[PDB]
Design a protein around this ligand. Structure first.
Ligand SMILES: N[C@@H](Cc1c[nH]c2ccccc12)C(=O)O
Ligand SMILES: [Mg+2]
Ligand SMILES: [Mg+2]
Ligand SMILES: [Mg+2]
Ligand SMILES: [Mg+2]
Ligand SMILES: [Mg+2]
Ligand SMILES: [Mg+2]
Ligand SMILES: [Mg+2]
Ligand SMILES: [Mg+2]
Ligand SMILES: [Mg+2]
Ligand SMILES: [Mg+2]
Ligand SMILES: [Mg+2]
Ligand SMILES: [Mg+2]
Ligand SMILES: [Mg+2]
Ligand SMILES: [Mg+2]
Ligand SMILES: [Mg+2]
Ligand SMILES: [Mg+2]
Lengths: 56, 142, 150, 110, 17, 117
RNA sequence: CCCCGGCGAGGGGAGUGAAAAAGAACCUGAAACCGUGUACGUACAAGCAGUGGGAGCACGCUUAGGCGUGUGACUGCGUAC
RNA sequence: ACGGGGCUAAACCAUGCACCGAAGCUGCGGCAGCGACGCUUAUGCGUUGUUGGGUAGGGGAGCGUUCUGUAAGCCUGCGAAGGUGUGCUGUGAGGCAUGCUGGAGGUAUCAGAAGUGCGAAUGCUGACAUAAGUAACGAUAAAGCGGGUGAAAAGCCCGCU
């Protein structure tokens, strides 16, 4: 099926009232490196919870 | 000169208490609907609610004439196919007596958002007691 | 219009409006509906209406003292500065000079003056008598115009 | 003082880039740079580069300080679309639009 | 292009003869 | 002599779309829709110039009827008594005194009662 | 020439010029269409979305006041071409 | 199977007096058509009577646009046309003045000629929407990891499965 009348720019932005992205709120800092990472993720230089887990 | 218009914030509203024992149902509802709307006031404006607050006591003692007590039927539909329900005047008084006065007055009020705000000013009780003594209602011998 | 006589699409079934030609004047780059041709815009004037208008025009110039009559108007050399100085003395700037027979010196002396036209008595026309501010006739051109005007 | 950076003819629909740009509107730049790092959107890579670019302009050209800057304005405009052909069943052809965008970021300390 | 296949088919088109 | 319609057509369209300010949706943006809306707005405005006279008089009668019954007489008997007393104030002014000067209005009701009685 | 960027695309300065919002996608740069900002309205309310009445709010005015501009709760009538 | 609420009259019959009720009639202000009669017109003024819903269709009077003459005139880099606002003005199509943009043309008056006015034609051309960030991403033979390069590697190169 297909529409009988063209939907308005208001009905189009009401449908999109739920499409908004939500930001990450909790950005944790490592205890030794002191830098930021996602919670429960290793830091970009290979630390996790104070210990160097990955020598890359 | 423009015709005077009542202003929703400045309008003055008073409280009245009515006893409904022995009064005919319809011939009391028309007096309520006049005063809920404010038709008794020189400042009456069609788009402003200028009426008064009214407490109706003894809603279960209201009277009807003829055989209306057994033969007046209230219908409503529940929204589901086949959902046509009915109640006679006698069993509305038994089950919920206030709805009888409220239903009657509601059909005599204007429809739309203003007629719904007028209906909020009517307080119907089945008994002789009310809780609004702090509002100091006046007796309305109507 | 250059093109083909082919029907752009079939008569029925395509869901588009009916077309029969790409040269249709409804289409972009199609023909003009009532295209022009070369035409002749000349009208007829009765001889008596043409001569009657000259007499009305001529008598108005006299009435508005825009007509000036002399018997002496010529220049000794075909020099534009000579005629321009002559006209300065007479207090004329925009002027039609009508002469019995046209001299070559006066014709050549006036070609470069754009406010001055010089004519023979046979070459007057209605529009030029109304256009110029003043008209100067030699009294031998005043003669010939009246026999021409019967 | 206000400083501007643009990315014109960015290759993404404005509706897709607008989702990312609404996240950092009115944020401090240090806060907005961390938000854009942890957003799993392609447009977040585009928006961040314009944000870093506008930050550098503020230092070099205008003598501004990073710690004061804030994302004052950000908006995404539609750009020209490129038109392509996609062939469908039974000999029909469709027109594909490859939409672009213009991304503008304004930072200011005030 | 040509007509849609259901608009050519007699069974679909000719339902009320 | 070819004439181009561009400059005249634009100004004629801009005249209609300025009268369509405040309308919803295409009615303020699109000429085919704004034209029909500006016509119907003029049809209503013509029709509602007659009705403005009917709706205000009907309002004055209701405010006289309300203030008169506060003095013990209905509208239909109040107006009749003013005719027998040869008082010629129109309803626009009576509805004005009812609200703003209730002591003058009482004097009018007594005059109506005296003539009617 | 400098700066961000991938020795990018794109941009911000500097400079030329009367003009660079004349920057090569370059005179003018309308409308549909899409956005950002501000003022008002809008989450108990039923329909050609206006019109007649109309409170409140915001911004200007000018005075011993109510006028202008925007918005429009509520209300009568109103089934496009 | 009263429009509804409600009604034992707020129903029906008879009599009466109020009042509401329309763009009807009256009041006030304005405009025009047609008659009649006259301060006298010189073809307009004054009074009076009356008329003014309109499709097919007939008659009358105009607005605006492009081009020609008037015009080697007039306005214009002290800012033209065009664009975009605001204010005033006419019974209407319209007109006039000005702020901002624009950056070199425009054109009174009175006549002349028209490719002279668009919302519709399943009209023609270009631009841009909607459905909608939705279906789909083309054989159900199938991938996994380590190293390299690189701004970035599921897909590129090497290796082993
Ligand atoms: N229905 C089939 C066969 C088909 C092709 N063309 C048609 C025309 C009419 C009826 C059926 C057909 C298809 O679309 O592939
Ligand atoms: Mg051609
Ligand atoms: Mg001949
Ligand atoms: Mg094929
Ligand atoms: Mg340009
Ligand atoms: Mg609400
Ligand atoms: Mg009456
Ligand atoms: Mg009336
Ligand atoms: Mg008529
Ligand atoms: Mg034409
Ligand atoms: Mg039409
Ligand atoms: Mg489409
Ligand atoms: Mg869907
Ligand atoms: Mg789905
Ligand atoms: Mg899918
Ligand atoms: Mg594949
Ligand atoms: Mg790998």
């Amino acid at each position: 099926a297909v529409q009988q009348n063209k939907p308005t720019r208001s009905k189009r932005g009401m449908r999109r009232s739920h499409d908004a992205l939500t930001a990450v709120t909790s950005l944790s800092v490592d205890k030794t490196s002191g830098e930021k990472h996602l919670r429960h993720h290793i830091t970009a230089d290979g630390y996790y919870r104070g210990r160097k887990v990955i020598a890359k | 000169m423009k015709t005077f218009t009542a202003k929703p914030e400045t309008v003055k509203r008073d409280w009245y208490v009515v006893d409904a024992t022995g009064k005919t149902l319809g011939r009391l509802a028309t007096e309520l609907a006049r005063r809920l709307r404010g038709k008794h006031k020189a400042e009456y404006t069609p788009h402003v609610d200028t009426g008064d607050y009214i407490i109706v006591l003894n809603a279960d003692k209201v009277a009807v004439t003829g055989n209306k007590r057994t033969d007046k039927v209230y219908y409503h539909h529940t929204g589901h196919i086949g959902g046509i329900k009915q109640a006679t005047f006698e069993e509305m008084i038994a089950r919920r007596p206030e709805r009888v006065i409220e239903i009657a007055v509601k059909g005599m009020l204007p429809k739309g958002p203003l007629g719904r705000a007028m209906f909020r000013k009517l307080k119907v009780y089945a008994g002789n007691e009310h809780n609004h003594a702090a509002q100091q209602p006046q007796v309305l011998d109507i | 219009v250059t093109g083909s006589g082919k029907k752009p699409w079939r008569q029925k079934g395509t869901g588009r409006a009916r077309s029969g030609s790409i040269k249709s004047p409804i289409w972009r780059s199609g023909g003009v509906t009532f295209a022009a041709r070369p035409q002749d815009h000349s009208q007829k004037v009765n001889k008596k209406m043409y001569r009657g208008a000259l007499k009305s025009i001529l008598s108005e110039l006299v009435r508005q003292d825009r007509l000036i009559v002399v018997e002496k108007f010529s220049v000794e050399a075909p020099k534009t500065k000579l005629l321009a100085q002559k006209l300065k003395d007479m207090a004329l700037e925009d002027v039609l000079i009508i002469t019995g027979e046209l001299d070559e010196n006066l014709f050549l002396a006036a070609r470069n003056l754009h406010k001055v036209d010089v004519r023979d008595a046979t070459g007057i026309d209605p529009v030029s008598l109304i256009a110029f501010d003043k008209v100067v006739m030699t009294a031998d051109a005043v003669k010939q115009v009246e026999e021409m005007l019967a | 003082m206000e400083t501007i950076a643009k990315h014109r003819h960015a290759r993404s629909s404005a509706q897709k880039v607008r989702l990312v740009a609404d996240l950092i509107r009115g944020k401090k730049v240090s806060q907005a740079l961390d938000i854009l790092t942890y957003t799993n959107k392609k447009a977040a890579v585009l928006v961040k580069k314009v944000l870093e670019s506008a930050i550098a302009n503020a230092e070099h050209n205008d003598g501004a300080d990073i710690d004061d800057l804030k994302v004052t304005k950000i908006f995404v405009d539609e750009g020209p679309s490129m038109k392509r052909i996609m062939p469908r069943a039974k000999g029909r052809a469709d027109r594909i639009l490859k939409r672009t965008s213009h991304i503008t970021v304004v930072v200011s300390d005030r | 292009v040509t007509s849609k296949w259901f608009n050519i088919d007699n069974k679909i088109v000719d339902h009320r003869p | 002599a070819r004439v181009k319609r561009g400059v005249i057509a634009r100004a004629r369209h801009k005249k209609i779309l300025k009268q369509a300010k405040g309308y919803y949706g295409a009615r303020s943006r699109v000429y085919r829709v704004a034209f029909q809306a500006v016509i119907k707005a003029g049809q209503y405005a013509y029709r509602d110039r007659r009705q403005r006279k009917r709706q205000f008089r009907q309002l004055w009668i209701a405010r006289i009827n309300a203030a008169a019954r506060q003095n013990g007489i209905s509208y239909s008997k109040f107006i009749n008594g003013l005719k027998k007393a040869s008082v010629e104030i129109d309803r626009k002014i009576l509805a004005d005194i009812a609200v703003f000067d209730k002591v003058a209005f009482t004097a009018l009701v007594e005059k109506a009662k005296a003539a009617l009685a």
